Design a protein around this ligand. Structure first.
Ligand SMILES: Nc1nc2c(ncn2[C@@H]2O[C@H](COP(=O)(O)OP(=O)(O)NP(=O)(O)O)[C@@H](O)[C@H]2O)c(=O)[nH]1
Ligand SMILES: Nc1nc2c(ncn2[C@@H]2O[C@H](COP(=O)(O)OP(=O)(O)NP(=O)(O)O)[C@@H](O)[C@H]2O)c(=O)[nH]1
Ligand SMILES: Nc1nc2c(ncn2[C@@H]2O[C@H](COP(=O)(O)O)[C@@H](O)[C@H]2O)c(=O)[nH]1
Ligand SMILES: [Mg+2]
Ligand SMILES: [Mg+2]
Lengths: 283, 274
């Protein structure tokens, strides 16, 4: 009654799926493993005669991707903060140059304000031209306090002062901005580790650019090994980017994406949902 | 199936994986490798010579963006450069790096801050200008980027600058930002720049071809600068952007410091892509 799936039944559809995932910026190596998983799960399985093999394959993949992402989800960040007895709850943001750290911090402030949580920002990028002025504009528009630190202060001193200030004023959250840095830059990685030792953050967020190809996974791997982080925010998804890095992160590193940036305004931030990701990719 | 035909096939298969893994646009990898395969079957009794295979790859890849060392000294003076590219790609920093490169070569350089959207865009470029000793024109109170661009170009031409470099706001051109492509076209029509330079992050993935194509249709891209080559990205997406536009790659960025810009080297880049 039921037909048995053989490898030959799967070849054409596996190739179409491979090019769909690759086009979605799921890296080559992860795409291959996922499709090998898929083939192995299906070889030998029975199926009705007038059922289309191709559709069972596609649905099995959508279901496997949904499970890979759903299993990696953690507690919602706002619930984490509210359930935390820590004041302030300290969050740090890092990642390579230009990915969107500073702007994402502003969106996070906006989201926290809507959830009735008080916030201050530590301007701990003390290197790049106009890094503090850029944050000062956002802080002013969001009507939150920016801590710039004393004149000439290094990133750790700025963060230390920000946390001390938040403690005495019972501020709910401190958000630490950091300069862009390459994951292979030993000196700057050390500068970051120095801020971490001093700030002891409750949550660490790596920022990845969703327009980035295979290097985004490489950034994530290196930073996890040299620094360590809790979650990822993917930016610039509004550039018609599929964001296949989300799948690679879960599959390879067991790291979750918690939000996605979808524009340059403060409201342009959405939570990550497996279902939403699967629909984006396959539709 | 001849032993040679088999050799060609396995070589082409391995090359396809390599280029895709380096983020070259997938469709492009297949069309490029199809041409290469055809050449390997038509050109040069003999069996597989990997060395000859590789030479044809380097040849077809080098064709794909020009052999010739880029000329980076302006044709006529004054020479107006307009920098464009995706949010965060490195435009403002690269403007400073370019100003530094030409100043070191004895040119009078002016920088124009024509980004009115990003907070502290003006401050950022002014600080870079202050650092390297190059004059920056901008109007922080003006919300019309074209007016700033035009006024800045006109003042620097009048004062006999040799090279004038216009920094512009980041944009990707999709969804709502189709209007930003229209604004870029309008700026292009008004300035009539001598070179439109697409500044592109080395790490860019599979969107690169279509995104660069959208840019090119709005305002023709003359040159490309690939930033962040000090990172680990292979750079195949940047290669894809170059093929979509027919533009010439002139410089790469190799760090955050203002002197970290160098002329593009085709052979090394092919080797990097692998
Ligand atoms: N379209 C779009 N642009 C975004 C998004 N997130 C950030 N950007 C834009 O990307 C650019 C770079 O953002 P920025 O916050 O300065 O990034 P950064 O990582 O802090 N840069 P740096 O490493 O130099 O500090 C800005 O123009 C910002 O508005 C997003 O989700 N969508
Ligand atoms: N490591 C490295 N960083 C670079 C390179 N070029 C630029 N950067 C860094 O990349 C980040 C983004 O630079 P920026 O000039 O602000 O880019 P932009 O395209 O003007 N941004 P926007 O689109 O928001 O206006 C900065 O941190 C800058 O220092 C490079 O070659 N290497
Ligand atoms: N809220 C607000 N922002 C403004 C106004 N005029 C300019 N800006 C902002 O100033 C920035 C551009 O000037 P600067 O480069 O000098 O920062 C942009 O972020 C722009 O949105 C205004 O009237 N209100
Ligand atoms: Mg920043
Ligand atoms: Mg800029």
């Amino acid at each position: 009654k039921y037909k048995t799936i053989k490898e030959d039944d799967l070849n054409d559809v596996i190739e179409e799926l491979r090019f769909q995932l690759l086009d979605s910026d799921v890296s080559y190596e992860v795409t291959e493993k996922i499709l090998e998983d898929l083939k192995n799960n299906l070889i030998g399985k029975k199926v009705s005669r007038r059922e289309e093999v191709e559709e069972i394959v596609i649905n099995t993949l959508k279901k496997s991707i949904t499970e890979i992402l759903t299993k990696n989800q953690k507690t919602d960040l706002i619930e984490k903060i509210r359930s935390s007895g820590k004041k302030p709850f300290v969050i740090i943001f890092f990642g390579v140059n230009g990915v969107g750290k500073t702007t994402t911090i502003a969106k996070v402030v906006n989201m926290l304000k809507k959830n009735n949580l008080s916030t201050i920002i530590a301007a701990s990028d003390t290197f790049r031209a106009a890094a503090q002025e850029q944050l000062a504009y956002h802080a002013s528009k969001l009507e939150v306090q920016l801590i710039r630190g004393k004149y000439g202060a290094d990133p750790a001193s700025v963060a230390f002062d920000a946390i001390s200030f938040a403690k005495s004023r019972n501020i709910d959250v401190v958000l630490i901005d950091t300069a862009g840095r390459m994951h292979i830059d030993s000196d700057l990685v050390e500068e970051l580790k120095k801020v971490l030792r001093i700030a002891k953050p409750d949550f660490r967020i790596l920022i990845l650019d969703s327009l980035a190809g295979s290097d985004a996974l490489e950034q994530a791997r290196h930073f996890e090994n040299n620094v360590g982080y809790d979650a990822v925010i993917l930016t610039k998804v509004d550039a018609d980017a599929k964001g296949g890095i989300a799948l690679s992160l879960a599959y390879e590193l067991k790291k979750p994406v918690v939000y996605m940036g979808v524009g340059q305004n403060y409201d342009d931030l959405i939570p990550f949902s497996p279902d939403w990701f699967v629909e984006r990719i396959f539709s | 199936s001849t032993p040679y035909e088999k050799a060609v096939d396995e070589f082409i298969k391995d090359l396809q994986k390599s280029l895709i893994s380096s983020d070259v646009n997938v469709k492009l990898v297949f069309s490029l490798t199809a041409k290469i395969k055809e050449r390997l079957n038509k050109e040069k009794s003999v069996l597989e010579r990997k060395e000859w295979f590789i030479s044809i790859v380097y040849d077809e890849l080098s064709k794909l963006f020009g052999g010739k060392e880029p000329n980076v000294n302006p044709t006529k003076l004054p020479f107006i450069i307009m920098l464009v590219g995706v949010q965060g790609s490195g435009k403002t920093t690269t403007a400073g790096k370019l100003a530094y490169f030409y100043k070191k070569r004895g040119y009078k350089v002016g920088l124009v801050a024509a980004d009115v959207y990003r907070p502290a865009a003006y401050d950022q470029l002014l600080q870079l200008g202050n650092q390297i000793g190059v004059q920056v024109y901008g109007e922080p109170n003006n919300q019309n980027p074209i007016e700033i661009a035009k006024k800045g170009v006109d003042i620097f031409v009048k004062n006999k600058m040799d090279i004038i470099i216009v920094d512009t706001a980041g944009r990707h051109g999709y969804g709502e930002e189709t209007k930003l492509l229209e604004e870029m076209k309008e700026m292009y029509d008004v300035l009539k720049p001598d070179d439109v330079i697409l500044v592109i992050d080395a790490s860019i993935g599979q969107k690169a071809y279509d995104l660069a194509s959208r840019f090119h249709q709005a305002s023709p891209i003359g040159s490309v600068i690939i930033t962040k080559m000090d990172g680990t990205a292979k750079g195949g997406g940047a290669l894809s952007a170059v093929v979509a536009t027919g533009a010439t790659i002139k410089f790469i960025g190799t760090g955050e410091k203002i002197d970290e810009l160098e002329t593009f080297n085709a052979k090394r880049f092919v080797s990097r892509i692998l």
